[PDB]
Amino acid sequence: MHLKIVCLSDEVREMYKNDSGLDLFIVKDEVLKPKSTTFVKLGIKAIALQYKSNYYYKNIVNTSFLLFPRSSISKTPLRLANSIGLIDAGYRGEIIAALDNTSDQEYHIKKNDKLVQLVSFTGEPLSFELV
Amino acid sequence: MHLKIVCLSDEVREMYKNDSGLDLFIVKDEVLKPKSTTFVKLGIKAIALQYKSNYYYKNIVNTSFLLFPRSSISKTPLRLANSIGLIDAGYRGEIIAALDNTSDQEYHIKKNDKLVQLVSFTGEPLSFELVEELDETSRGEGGFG
Amino acid sequence: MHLKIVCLSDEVREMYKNDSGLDLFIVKDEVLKPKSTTFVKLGIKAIALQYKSNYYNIVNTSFLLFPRSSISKTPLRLANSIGLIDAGYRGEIIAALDNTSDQEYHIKKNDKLVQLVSFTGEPLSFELVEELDETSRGEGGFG
Numbered sequence: 001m002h003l004k005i006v007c008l009s010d011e012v013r014e015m016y017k018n019d020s021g022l023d024l025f026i027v028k029d030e031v032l033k034p035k036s037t038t039f040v041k042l043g044i045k046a047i048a049l050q051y052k053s054n055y056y057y058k059n060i061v062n063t064s065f066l067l068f069p070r071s072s073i074s075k076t077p078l079r080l081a082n083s084i085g086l087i088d089a090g091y092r093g094e095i096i097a098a099l100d101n102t103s104d105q106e107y108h109i110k111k112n113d114k115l116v117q118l119v120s121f122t123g124e125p126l127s128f129e130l131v
Numbered sequence: 132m133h134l135k136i137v138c139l140s141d142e143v144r145e146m147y148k149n150d151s152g153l154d155l156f157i158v159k160d161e162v163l164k165p166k167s168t169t170f171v172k173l174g175i176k177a178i179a180l181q182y183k184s185n186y187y188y189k190n191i192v193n194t195s196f197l198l199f200p201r202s203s204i205s206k207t208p209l210r211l212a213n214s215i216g217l218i219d220a221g222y223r224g225e226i227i228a229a230l231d232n233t234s235d236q237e238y239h240i241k242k243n244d245k246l247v248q249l250v251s252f253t254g255e256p257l258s259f260e261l262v263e264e265l266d267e268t269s270r271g272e273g274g275f276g
Numbered sequence: 277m278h279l280k281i282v283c284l285s286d287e288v289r290e291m292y293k294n295d296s297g298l299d300l301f302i303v304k305d306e307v308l309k310p311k312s313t314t315f316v317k318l319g320i321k322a323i324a325l326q327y328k329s330n331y332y333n334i335v336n337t338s339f340l341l342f343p344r345s346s347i348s349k350t351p352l353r354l355a356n357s358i359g360l361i362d363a364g365y366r367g368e369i370i371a372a373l374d375n376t377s378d379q380e381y382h383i384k385k386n387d388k389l390v391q392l393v394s395f396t397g398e399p400l401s402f403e404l405v406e407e408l409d410e411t412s413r414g415e416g417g418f419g
């Protein structure tokens with residue numbers, strides 16, 4: 001699967017320029033309140049491209065995709081609130097992690113953290129480019 | 132993917148006789164107790180149909196499908212207990228959202244809330260039609276009585 | 277999709293010598309501390325084989341670790357929601373379990389909290405194998 005990632009600032013641009021899931025960065029440092037849900041914005045828009053398939057309903061196409069937590073989230077108190085995000089074919093907005101902080105204390109996330117990852121429905125290796 | 136949905140009452144049939152995720156309705160008002168897991172019955176049974184694929188094991192078929200939370204559940208204190216529901220190919224039971232209330236007060240869900248959605252393993256667009264039975268079995272809602 | 281599983285002990289092998297999800301066993305009795313997350317080792321390694329596709333004849337493939345429906349009736353939740361096991365991976369399979377309760381939680385050998393699933397949702401078969409490949413982490417090769 002092929003991703004077109006529009007980075008939304010220059011600082012993020014330099015993150016991405018500088019295997020069935022594609023990691024995303026935590027873009028700005030942030031304190032997560034205790035016992036909370038926080039919509040962390042990821043500083044990108046994306047589209048996923050695949051070959052057309054024939055499907056039961058009653059060239060390359062625009063496809064839907066998935067935001068999975070990274071295994072390593074399990075070592076933090078943070079959980080993805082909506083379990084696995086579903087990002088529809090038509091979505092053109094910023095890509096956001098819904099993160100629950102399950103701890104009684106605040107949690108500091110920092111630019112450079114990869115908590116989350118993009119994945120294809122079919123689990124096929126991922127490729128991307130900027131746009 | 133194409134779903135065939137059996138509505139378990141006229142009320143639910145009305146809701147449905149009126150996208151990569153097909154949203155499902157909360158079908159009865161209900162209170163979830165604080166700090167609880169509640170099995171919320173969604174008033175439907177369903178069969179998913181896809182084109183026959185060739186697969187490594189060593190036309191139009193029944194297929195497995197997925198039950199996902201909605202994005203917007205994020206804003207509530209409710210979480211899907213089993214992360215993502217896996218519904219096997221010939222499952223004929225009622226569809227159920229196992230919902231954790233993570234908060235310490237009650238949570239009132241309401242007829243027409245949409246917490247949860249059905250999704251194909253391929254992430255392809257979903258259709259559905261309403262049907263009276265899934266098969267001839269009493270669990271499919273079919274056959275004699 | 278077809279799985280080859282290496283059982284890391286004879287005990288584990290006996291349980292596996294004795295449908296779109298393949299249930300995996302709790303392999304040893306364990307107490308999980310209250311309000312914690314525990315990396316529970318499942319005593320197996322696995323590889324998944326499917327038909328080569330074409331993206332944008334038989335291939336080694338990535339796969340999914342799902343909670344079982346019945347996990348819902350316990351206080352135990354999957355930390356990472358759904359675990360993604362990459363095609364390359366040769367380590368022991370681990371379930372990261374959040375004990376959401378105030379009390380210790382006892383899991384027993386032969387409990388089944390978690391299951392393996394295909395990215396396609398297709399029916400799963402499996403066999404037991406002594407190695408995944410020739411590497412040491414794959415448990416194969418000289419030694």
Ligand SMILES: O=c1ccn([C@H]2C[C@H](O)[C@@H](CNC(c3ccccc3)(c3ccccc3)c3ccccc3)O2)c(=O)[nH]1
Pocket residue numbers: 039067082084085086087088091093094095096097098202203205206
């Ligand atoms: O994990 C995901 C899942 C979906 N999406 C998508 C494509 C979806 O339509 C869209 C859903 N917007 C919200 C939102 C909507 C309704 C109510 C509350 C929040 C959202 C919810 C959860 C996670 C991410 C985003 C949202 C809107 C505005 C500000 C914050 C959050 O983003 C993500 O970007 N990440």
Ligand SMILES: O=c1ccn([C@H]2C[C@H](O)[C@@H](CNC(c3ccccc3)(c3ccccc3)c3ccccc3)O2)c(=O)[nH]1
Pocket residue numbers: 170198213215216217218219222224225226227228229345346348349
């Ligand atoms: O999210 C899901 C996932 C699966 N299913 C399916 C197809 C699955 O085999 C089957 C599993 N029924 C139970 C259950 C089984 C064993 C132990 C405890 C509960 C269930 C569990 C979690 C969520 C929903 C349903 C269930 C059965 C009877 C009464 C309540 C709950 O339903 C759902 O309907 N929704």
Ligand SMILES: O=c1ccn([C@H]2C[C@H](O)[C@@H](CNC(c3ccccc3)(c3ccccc3)c3ccccc3)O2)c(=O)[nH]1
Pocket residue numbers: 071072074075315341356358359360361362365367368369370371372
């Ligand atoms: O649910 C899953 C998901 C992935 N994996 C795989 C394939 C992955 O690369 C790899 C990730 N190991 C850890 C880990 C990774 C990074 C940082 C800290 C821990 C992990 C994380 C979540 C769940 C299970 C395992 C891990 C390694 C050693 C000891 C404990 C935890 O295991 C699982 O076995 N189960």
